[PDB]
Design a protein around this ligand. Structure first.
Ligand SMILES: OC[C@H]1O[C@@](CO)(O[C@H]2O[C@H](CO)[C@@H](O)[C@H](O)[C@H]2O)[C@@H](O)[C@@H]1O
Length: 580
DNA sequence: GCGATCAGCAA
DNA sequence: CGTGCTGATCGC
């Protein structure tokens, strides 16, 4: 049942038609400066396989790749675009990306290869990538005959599936979401990843040295207090020392033993001096292992840059994720960890880091969608939302809001932004589930529009089977009808929350597209480096800061027009740490 | 080697 | 009893 195709030794004119399904295969998970193992082209003239060395050296093929008027349909075009950028080759004209199309149709499917996307439309004349390349240590590129047939079958699937996928997207009112938002964003993320972020490795190595010393000191103190040496990083061995040898009370249990999480340890500190030391050890160790050694492992020795990969087709909220390295969770809340950011510096001499972030975009989105009079007024006055929330739920005047009250209201707001349960809020505030539920009840009394929205969206999710965001992103919630309380409750919370987090994701994605267009019109050298959910990090010549102070916030604030204003704060400095 | 476990970081 | 990511430990 083999598929017919030409194993070309050279490029020909019919291979350069104005429309084609194109496969530029990069097997390595991390595609930065990675090998392209094969190329496949399927168009009106037939199916072809090309060896990279040949195609990529052919002037006509390269010109075809870079010609925006020659339309290509692909799967994960960002992967191909970046691998080509490392080879100094520009990829243009990608009018359809099957990975992004599948992602928008149903992000829950977890489509990660052509075969998975194809199976959505009952097309199975293509093998999963894992079946062809294997996994782990067994991972390997097969012989040419096997490789060629696979790439051709993937190209063939893309060629056949474009129409049905576009048709369904159109029915879902998601055609513009793909063509005007996700696909243009894919090219921007490609530029960001390729640019990378410069790292001051010397600074990082010096911090590591200092941490190594502090860890050694705390480590010995721990053994001294424990009366014996053991593996501190082993919750198992640690649990024995704490709850058996030292007899500390067991306040929480894990699936396999005693809980030793920070929240638990904090409660045990008063009982024994070893506890504070364990917490200190955990803090230093986390910075050392994850943020010092971890970062140093992925920095490119020649340029001293790290090149993350943004996964644009994973979350059911529409948010982006970051890997190898993950640059969306670099420490900032605790000063010792925050210092790690001093190691992230501008890539050019006399350039600076510029960071802009939306102020409470999620709650502003909620005010808009729920049309809650109180919440909308709060943002129209640009009030400190935590103080305002405290005033309302605790029924007091602004001057009567104490620090503890604001902290708890802030936690309630966090819970609303991330859609946590009463149990989750209770754990975050170290209170009972009942008291946490009471806080939520008071919040609904103060913001009846939000309560009405939460009730209505849950009913809508049950009726339609899904919920949608501002720009029509969709999330199916089959568990909304489950007779299992916990399972159904999570689905209900996601029905309430996805439109909030998801719309915020839509907005910043559009802002990135609008920003790049403006930077180009203005002829600025400034460029995006990272996205951290509601923040955008750029670098630019020091001479462009003043213009950026006005341009970036404006473009981000005007990305969409809501019933309440959008507000963006910004800072810049010599390092990411200083961009505060 | 590799998956399960537990831990902790960010918006 | 939000998510996604990475790292240390540990049994098969
Ligand atoms: O010196 C290494 C040796 O010490 C043990 C404890 O007996 O573990 C310590 O060192 C590890 C590496 O720094 C940490 O992960 C661990 O938390 C700390 O207690 C042994 O496991 C190890 O062989």
């Amino acid at each position: 049942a083999k598929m017919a195709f030409t194993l070309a030794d050279r490029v020909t004119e019919e291979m350069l038609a104005d429309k084609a399904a194109l496969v530029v295969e990069v097997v390595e998970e991390n595609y930065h400066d990675a090998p392209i193992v094969g190329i496949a082209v399927v168009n009106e003239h037939g199916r072809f396989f090309l060896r990279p060395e040949t195609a990529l050296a052919d002037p006509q093929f390269v010109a075809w790749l870079g010609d925006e008027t020659k339309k290509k349909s692909m799967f994960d075009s960002k992967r191909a675009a970046v691998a080509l950028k490392w080879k100094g080759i520009e990829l243009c004209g990608v009018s359809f990306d099957l990975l992004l199309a599948a992602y928008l149709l149903d992000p829950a499917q977890g489509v990660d290869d052509v075969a998975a996307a194809a199976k959505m439309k009952q097309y199975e004349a293509v093998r999963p990538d894992e079946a062809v390349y294997g996994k782990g240590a067994k991972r390997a590129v097969p012989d040419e005959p096997v490789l060629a047939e696979h790439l051709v079958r993937k190209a063939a699937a893309i060629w056949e599936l474009e129409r049905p996928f576009l048709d369904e997207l159109r029915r879902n009112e998601q055609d513009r979401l793909l063509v005007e938002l996700e696909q243009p964003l894919s090219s921007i993320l490609a530029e960001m990843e390729f640019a990378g972020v410069k790292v001051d490795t010397k600074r990082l190595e010096q911090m590591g040295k200092e941490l190594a010393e502090q860890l050694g000191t705390v480590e010995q103190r721990i053994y001294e207090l424990a009366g014996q040496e053991f593996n501190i990083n082993s919750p198992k061995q640690l649990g024995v020392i704490l709850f058996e040898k030292l007899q500390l009370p067991v306040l929480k249990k894990t699936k396999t033993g005693y809980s030793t999480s920070a929240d638990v340890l904090e409660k045990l500190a008063p009982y024994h001096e070893i506890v504070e030391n364990i917490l200190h050890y955990r803090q230093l160790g986390k910075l050392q292992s994850t943020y010092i050694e971890g970062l140093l492992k992925v920095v490119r020795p020649d340029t001293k840059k790290v090149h993350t990969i943004f996964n644009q087709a994973l979350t059911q909220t529409g948010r982006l994720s970051s890997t190898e390295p993950n640059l969306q969770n670099i420490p900032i809340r605790l000063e010792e960890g925050r210092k790690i950011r001093q190691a992230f510096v501008p890539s050019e001499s006399d350039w600076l880091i510029f960071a802009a972030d939306y102020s409470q975009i999620e709650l502003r989105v909620l005010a808009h969608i729920a049309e809650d009079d109180n919440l909308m007024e709060a943002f129209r006055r640009d009030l400190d939302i935590h103080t305002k929330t405290a005033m309302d739920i605790f029924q007091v005047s602004e001057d009567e809001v104490t620090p503890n009250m604001r902290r708890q209201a802030k936690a309630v707001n966090f819970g609303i932004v991330y859609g946590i349960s009463d149990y989750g809020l209770a754990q975050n505030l170290n209170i009972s589930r009942k008291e946490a539920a009471e806080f939520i009840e008071r919040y609904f009394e103060s913001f009846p529009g939000v309560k009405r929205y939460m009730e209505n969206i849950v009913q809508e999710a049950k009726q339609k089977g899904y919920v949608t965001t501002l720009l029509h992103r969709r999330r199916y919630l089959p568990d909304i009808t489950s007779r299992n309380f916990n399972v159904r409750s999570f689905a209900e919370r996601m029905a309430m929350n996805t439109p909030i987090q998801g719309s915020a994701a839509d907005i910043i994605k559009k802002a990135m597209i609008d920003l790049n267009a403006r930077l180009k019109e203005e002829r600025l050298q400034a460029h995006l480096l990272l996205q951290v959910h509601d923040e955008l990090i750029l670098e630019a010549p020091k001479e462009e800061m003043e213009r950026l102070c006005r341009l970036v916030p404006e473009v981000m604030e005007q990305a969409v027009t809501l019933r309440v204003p959008l507000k963006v704060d910004y800072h810049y400095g010599s390092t990411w740490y200083d961009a505060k």
